[PDB]
Amino acid sequence: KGDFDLQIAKQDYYTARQELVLNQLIKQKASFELLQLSYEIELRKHRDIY
C-alpha cells in the first residue's frame, strides 16, 4: 500500500504536469492557427480586391 501510494502520489503529479504541458502545446497551436488564419483572410481580401 505504501509502495503503491508513493508512486501514485507521484503519478497524479505526472498526469497534472504532463496535461499542463499538453495544454501549453494546445495554446501555442491555437495561437499559430489564429495567426495563419489571419494570413489566409488577408490573402483572400487581396485576391477579392484584385
Partner: peptide, 28 residues
C-alpha cells in the same frame, strides 16, 4: 499528432509574409 502540425506552423508562418507579398508585388 500535435508536433506534426506544430513544426509545420512555424515554418509556414515564416514564409507567410513571403508568398502574400509575392502576390502583392506581382498580381494585386
Amino acid at each position: 499528432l500535435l508536433i506534426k502540425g506544430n513544426s509545420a506552423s512555424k515554418t509556414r508562418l515564416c514564409r507567410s509574409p513571403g508568398e502574400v507579398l509575392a502576390l502583392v508585388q506581382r498580381k494585386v
